[PDB]
Structure formats: structure tokens, C-alpha cells
Amino acid sequence: MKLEQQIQRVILEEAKALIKDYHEYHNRVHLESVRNKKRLGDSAPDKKIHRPNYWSFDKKFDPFYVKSNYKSIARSIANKIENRTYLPNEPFTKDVPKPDGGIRKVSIYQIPDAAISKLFFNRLLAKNRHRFSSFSYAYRNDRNVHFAIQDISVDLKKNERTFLAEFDFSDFFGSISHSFLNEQFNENGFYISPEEKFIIRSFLRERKVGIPQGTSISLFLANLTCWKLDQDLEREGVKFSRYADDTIIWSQEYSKICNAFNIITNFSKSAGIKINPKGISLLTKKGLPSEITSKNNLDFLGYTLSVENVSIKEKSVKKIKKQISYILYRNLIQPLKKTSLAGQTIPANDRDKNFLIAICEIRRYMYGGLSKSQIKDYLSGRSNRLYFKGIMSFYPLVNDVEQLKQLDGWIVSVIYRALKLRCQLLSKWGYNRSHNFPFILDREDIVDKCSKKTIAGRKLFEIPSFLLIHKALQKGLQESGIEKIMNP
Template sequence: MLHRSSNIRITSKKKKVKTEINSKKYSGFIKLDVSNFYPTIKHCKILEELQKKISNPEIITFIKRSISTPTVSKSHLGDEESTIGVPQGLSISNILASIYLLKIDEQLKDYPNVAYHRYVDDIFIMCDYQSVEDISNNVIRKFEEIKLVIHEPNGDSGKSVLGKIDEKFDYLGYQFKGGLISPRTTSIEKLKDSIVSIFTSYKYAKDKNKEFLLWRLNLRITGCIFQNKSRGWMFFFLGINNETILYNLDRHIKHLMDRFNINIKPKHFVRSYYEIMYSKHKTTYIPNFDGYTIKQMKEVLVSCFKLKVDSLSDEQVKFEFEKRISKQVKDLLTDVQDFS
């Protein structure tokens, strides 16, 4: 539940950043990254803030023990409790980190003519370009006051960057440049590799099934609705406005069809984008597996999975269908907001 909640915040933040960039109100940006964030969080500071918000001493004690226990495979009697650092594996790690930075967040959100965003240790600020150095220096000082170090802006690490809003920069999975919003290059390459693997699996399959190849490929292109979630690359990166990326992906598939000498008619990324943007709840181009009839389920099971369904009850058909769909969509990117 906490993981889902954090992902919803990311999705919401992406939309807000996109809107603010498109508003043309800001000419500069500040992207700062905290060095070694979780291991350098001071326990005394967290506990001080928690005590202001939580009156139950047992909860405070529980949290203190959770963050103070030495993080080694075998603890020994006499091991000293740590007074610094929050284990990243805790379910409450992100919440504690947010509490630790609450005062800074409140102060920076009150800055005039500034758009401030932070996700965990990744800070992004939009402002007038003439002010980027002054504002970034002020932010760095505020973090130093709570013993946190920011990577040097425009330094060798590349993790903290100051620049003009029309220059290229990455934030929360997107690449922004001159008004164009694209997925990061690594995300595009990962998608391309996954498409190649679909063709390769078909090439080396003992029993080749062209219907299954086309179905898998279309699923990778369009995504789908399953268990009331929007799943797939296109849903996840719907915030893009660089359509050249989509045309290039369609050309990539055409190239693979020629390379593997396969004659099929797959769906297209470009049309998928427009269907989701403008006909999300009416389109039949994007499969909504939640709305499939028993007849449609049988058709998929027979044509794609070569399953004999004549003797199966409706409940058995539904079970076999959902089991196979679950397996096929498990590695699709998921827009964690409900399909609504």
C-alpha cells in the first residue's frame, strides 16, 4: 500500500511539473541530489519531529528501535545502537525521510516565483534563470544545517544541475528539452529490447505460433487494462509530447519484421497514444481484459495459448484466462492509479 501511494505521488508530480514547464512562467531550473541520503539522516532530528506529531510514546519507542538496530546479519550483545542513518528496507523509510525534510519543504514552497518539488532525495526547482545560483546556494545551506550534503551543482557526478528551462534535463523518468517531453533514453532502449525479445522467442520456439507472437507484440505496443489498472509503456509515459519517439518505435517494429522475415500486421504506438489520450474509455484498440466476455476469453485461450476449452466451465475459463494474462502483463509498466 505504501509503495502504491508513493507511486501515485510520482505520477501526480510528473503531471504538475509538465503543467508548470508548459506555463512558460520559469526560465531556469535547479536539480539537486542529496549525497548518501538515508545513511546520513540524524535520528535525534527525526525523533524530535515525531514527538511533535505523535503523542503515543510506544510508537515513538518502536520507531526508535527500528532505526537504531544495527543493520548486520547477526547482531551481538553489546553492539551499540546507531544514532545516524535510516535503513532503506523499512516500510516507513520514505515517510521518515519526508518528516526529516518537512521544515525545508515548507520553507521552500513559500519562496515567491518558484515552483518547488521533492521526491525523496531528488529536488527540482523552477525559477527565473538569473536566480538559479542564489536559490541553489540557499537550498544547499538549508540542507547543511541538518547535516545533509548536496552533490555539487554542475559537478563531475552530474547528479545536481543548474540550467535554463529549455536545456535538456531528466526528472522522474522523463527527459525535458526545449518544450519537448520524452521518456528517458534508457526507458526507450529497454522497451526496444523487450520487443526484440518477443521476436527472438518466436524465432527459436519449437512450436511457432504466429497468433501468439502478434498478440504479445500488440500487448507490448498498446498496453491493456487488467485488474482495474492501466498497464503498459504507453500508459506510463502518457505525459510525453514528443511524437517522433512513437513514430520511431513503429519503424523499429517494421525493421524487426523485415529482419526476422515475419509478415504480420501489428498495432501502432502512434495510434495507441491518441486512443488513450482522447478515447480512453471508449476505445477497443486497447484491450480491456476486465471487460472480456467468456467468448472472448475462449478465443484468446484457443488462438494464442492453444488451450482446449470445450470441456471447461465458465469459471474454469475465467481462471485459465486470468492466470495467463497475469503472467503476460507482470513485466509491463503499471500506471498505479485506478482506471477511471
């Protein structure tokens, strides 16, 4: 297995995956444009298939070109690696505003360079896995971050008073002396072959200072740089998790968190670059007071973790409500707020097709398309497996039944109100349909009536409920674990 063959394999697979993604993109756009023509009638806009802009910045960004000449590309890359002259091209970078007001520098390396990064740094991470800390993650969408969440959640329950502290490592990775990184190469038992060291130094040479964030090589260089910080924090007895440019350190003692603050400062001085807290607080059982500045809720990604429950962050709930509300608006209000209703099917005969489309869209967003019969078959024992998709697949550790119950109420209320305004607009256009099924149900009757309706023998009107799929999530986490439900 020569290096050229490995490069050819990896580059071909990366380009093939990107080509499959583009194909599915334009196919999806066409299907959506068919449905949008049906929805918005003549007013419906026309399809506009885009191509990722960076594809034109360089030809090796474009997956199709790379697939065209991946053998030559890999041939030259292999020669460059063997002659120790390889240097990755410039990543197409785009700095993006962050909610704190900073900039998250997105970096897209060209397909050959990203293929090399995966091929080498995945091997390095696999071979040095036991040398790294437990909860170190590179992306904030990393599925395995949920394990860290679990840990903190468990502690926040068992420890009824936990001192926490949060930190931002953005400037560390933006400007970390490459000398420090190169010093760490032969410490802590790391196994980095000479060629792997050359590739590391080459990706660092294409850069000048800092580690490229949100990339294949991010996790390795981050763990390699932060190995001593992890070791000191582990000796202090503090528990910690780094995700992307954030770090959370929790303990049952105040002295420990203060000593961790000192450790982080000393490691920053050793690095020649500073780490700044977002900073320090105490989480306690709700109702119980606190001595230091305290907060009874911690925002960990899309989770609010408290000593009592794990819930969905308020921003995540607002986003879920935004998506459901826009589904109902797009399907039941927007088409009827257009200048003309030419080619827009009007609800009649006790059938509103737009309402079926909206309910199914909400079910896909929430359940993934599961029926309440399927979820109950899984919850009873009839079914030995349920596919977990939709929004709740991203919040598998939620255990706040009240939040889900409130969202159920909100879904029903918004369905009623949107249907009511749809009736109002329809009557404005000239169609009186208040007596028809979609518009006659009271809010306290929508769920029952919809549960009873059946089209094609399948109950496709049942209003999706968060609590049912939450029960299913709990059973599936007691049966498979986080990893299985997050990815099947």
C-alpha cells in the first residue's frame, strides 16, 4: 500500500462525496420547486441551481475537476511528500460574525489538501487516542460532545453544588506559537512518525501562527498543544471539556476552580498567547441560595443543564418554534397573502392539502416522519427498533417533561391560530370555509379530530408531540446508548 494509492483513494472519496452532495442538492431543489409551484401557483418563483462559490476560486476546490484528474493530483502530491516539498494551498477562508461579536474563521482547504489532512491526522488521532483527554472535541456539532454533556449533567445532579467556569480559546488557536506546537511533538508519549511531522509542519507552514479551526487537523494540534493544560487540570482534580474554541471546567470545590484559573493563565503565558473567560459561578439546587455569584442553569451547546434536569436552551426552543411556525406560515398563510391566487388550490370539500403538507413537514422536522403508532410499538415492545431522526435526535439527553409539554401546547395553539388566519384570508378572497374540517376545530379539539382522520389508511393528520418521541428517546438511550441513537 504505497502513499500514492492512499492519496488517490482518499481524494477520490472526498470528491465523490461532494459530487453526491451536489447531485442531491439540485435534485432536492427541483422537487422543492415542483411543490412550490403547486403551493404558490403562478406567483411561485423559478428554480435557480447554484454551485458553491469557492468552486471557482480554484479548480481543486471543485469536486468534479478533482475527480477528473485525481490520479495526477495524487501522483504529484506523493512526490511532493516524498521529496519533502509539499505545502497545502491556501484554504478558502471566510471569517464569519460570532454572537459574542468575534469572528469564527471558517477555512476550507482544497479537496486534495483536505484529503491529505484526513488521511494523516485521522491516523495520528487514532494512534494517540489514549494520550488525549476524554472530553476534547474539535467541532461544536461533534456528536460525541453529548458524552461530555452527560458527564456534567450527571455531576450536576449527584453534586448538588458544583462550581463551574467557562473559557474561550479562540485567540489561542488563532495565534499559538508554532514553536510551542513543535516542542510538544516528542512529549506525553505521542507517536508522530517523521512523515506525519513533516505534514504537520507543512500545514503549519501554509499558515503562519495558529491552528486552522474547524478542519481535519484541528483536533490533533489542539490536543497536542493542550496536553499539559489537560494534565495539570486533571491533577488538580477538576473535570473539563473542550469543544471547538470553548472550555468548561467544573468541580465540587471552589479552590479547585480557582487553581484551574491559575493553571490556564500559566499555560497561556507558556504559549505566548492569552485565554480569556467568556466566567466563574456555582450551580446549586433551585431554591437553595448561594454564596458566590451563582446561576442555576448552564448553557452547554443546545442544552440548558441544571441540577434537576437537562432541557433545551431557550435559543434552541426559539429556533424549533421558528421552524414549526414558518412551516405553517409557508403552507397555510403565505400563499394566500400573494397578489393573485392563480394556480393555488383552495381548501374545499373538508380537505386542506396545505394542512396535510404542513403537518407532515412538522412531523419530519420533529419525528423524522414517525407515526405515533410506530413510537408506541417501540415503547410497548411490539417493535424492537425505532429510527430516531428529526430535531429531537439533536437533543437526546433532554429530561424536562414540562418543557416538552409546553411545546406541545404551543404547537396546538399555533396550528389553531394559523388555520384561523388562513380561514380569514380565504374568506377575504371569497372562499367561506369556517364550517369545513380544517377551520371548524376548536383548539381543544384539534389533536383528537386529527388523530381520528385517516388518509390512505394512514393517520397523517396527527399533531406531532414532543413527549411521545421523548419517551421513545429515553427507551432508546437505555437500549442502545447515545452513539446509536445519534447516528444509526
